[PDB]
Amino acid sequence: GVVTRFGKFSHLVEPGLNWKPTFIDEVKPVNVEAVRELAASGVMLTSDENVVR
C-alpha cells in the first residue's frame, strides 16, 4: 500500500496491520498482488483475403 502527506509521494506502507496515527495523511488502499487476466478476440483479415477468429 501507499500513503501520502497532503498529496505527496510518501513512504509506501508495509503489509498487514500497521497501527500508525496520522489524520492529515491519507492512504490509497489497493495495489493487489496476484496474477490477472484480460482476454481478447475478434475477426481479422489475412494477407490472402480471408477471415479468421
Binding site: 508495509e14 498487514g16 497501527w19 498482488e33 496476484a34 496474477v35
Partner: protein, 56 residues
C-alpha cells in the same frame, strides 16, 4: 519492533495439473493429452532474486 517483517517460503514438494491442450503428431494427426509435474525448490536464494514476489 516495527521496522521488519518476514515471509514464509514453502520447501515441500509441489504439484501443478494442466488441462487438455492440442498437438499434432508426425503424420498429420491431432491428439489431446494431459500431464502433471512435480517440482521442488533447489537453492533457497536465487528463488527470491529471480521470482521476487515469493508467490508460487
Amino acid at each position: 519492533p516495527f521496522i521488519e517483517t518476514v515471509k514464509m517460503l514453502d520447501a515441500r514438494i509441489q504439484t501443478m495439473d494442466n488441462q487438455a491442450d492440442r498437438f499434432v503428431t508426425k503424420e498429420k494427426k491431432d491428439l489431446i493429452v494431459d500431464s502433471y509435474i512435480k517440482w521442488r525448490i533447489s537453492d533457497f536464494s536465487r528463488y527470491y532474486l529471480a521470482t521476487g514476489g515469493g508467490d508460487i
